[PDB]
Amino acid sequence: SMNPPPPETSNPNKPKRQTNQLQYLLRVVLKTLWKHQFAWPFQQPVDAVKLNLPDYYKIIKTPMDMGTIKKRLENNYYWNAQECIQDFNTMFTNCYIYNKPGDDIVLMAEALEKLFLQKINELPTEE
Ligand SMILES: Cc1cc(-c2ccccc2)n2nc(N)nc2n1
C-alpha cells in the first residue's frame, strides 16, 4: 500500500545524447500529449496512497508516467529515442494491465496512445 521511490530521472554516469529524434520526442510528442484534456492522471507517478490503490505497486513493477518522461527529456537522461518510446509504452501498458477495459482511465490512456502513435509514425530520420 505505500508508494515506491519514483523512477530515476538523473544519473550522472549514464551516457547521454540530445538527438533530433529525442528533440522531436520532447517538442512534438510529450508536448502534444501533455496539453491534452486527458493528460492530468498521467502527469506524475501514480500515488497509490491518495488514490487508495494499495495493490497498484504489487501489480505494476515498472512504473512510468509523463512527469517522469518530461524530467528525463528536459534533463537529457536518454541515449536514444527508443528508450523514451519504451517509457511511453510502459506507461500505457501499465494502465491497461492494472485496469479493466472501458474504465475511464483506460479510455484516457487510449486517446493519448492514439496521438502518440500518430506522432511516432512521423519520427524524423536521425540526422
Ligand atoms: C496512470 C493512472 C492514473 C490514475 C489516476 C486515476 C484518477 C485520478 C488520478 C490518477 N489511475 N487510476 C487507476 N485505477 N489506474 C491509474 N493509472
UniProtKB/Swiss-Prot annotation:
Transmembrane segments: none
Compartment(s) of residence: Nucleus; Chromosome
Superkingdom of this protein's organism: Eukaryota
Covalent link Glycyl lysine isopeptide (Lys-Gly) (interchain with G-Cter in SUMO2), residues: K58
Record-annotated site: Acetylated histone binding: N99
Similarity field: Belongs to the BET family.
Reported disease: Cornelia de Lange syndrome 6: A form of Cornelia de Lange syndrome, a clinically heterogeneous developmental disorder associated with malformations affecting multiple systems. It is characterized by facial dysmorphisms, abnormal hands and feet, growth delay, cognitive retardation, hirsutism, gastroesophageal dysfunction and cardiac, ophthalmologic and genitourinary anomalies. CDLS6 inheritance is autosomal dominant. A chromosomal aberration involving BRD4 is found in a rare, aggressive, and lethal carcinoma arising in midline organs of young people. Translocation t(15;19)(q14;p13) with NUTM1 which produces a BRD4-NUTM1 fusion protein.
Miscellaneous comment text of the record: JQ1, a thieno-triazolo-1,4-diazepine derivative, and I-BET, a benzodiazepine derivative, have been tested on tumors with success. Treatment with GSK1210151A (I-BET151, a I-BET derivative) has strong effets on mixed lineage leukemia and promotes myeloid differentiation and leukemia stem-cell depletion.
Protein name: Bromodomain-containing protein 4
Organism the protein comes from: Homo sapiens
Shown residues within the full chain: 44 to 168 of 1362
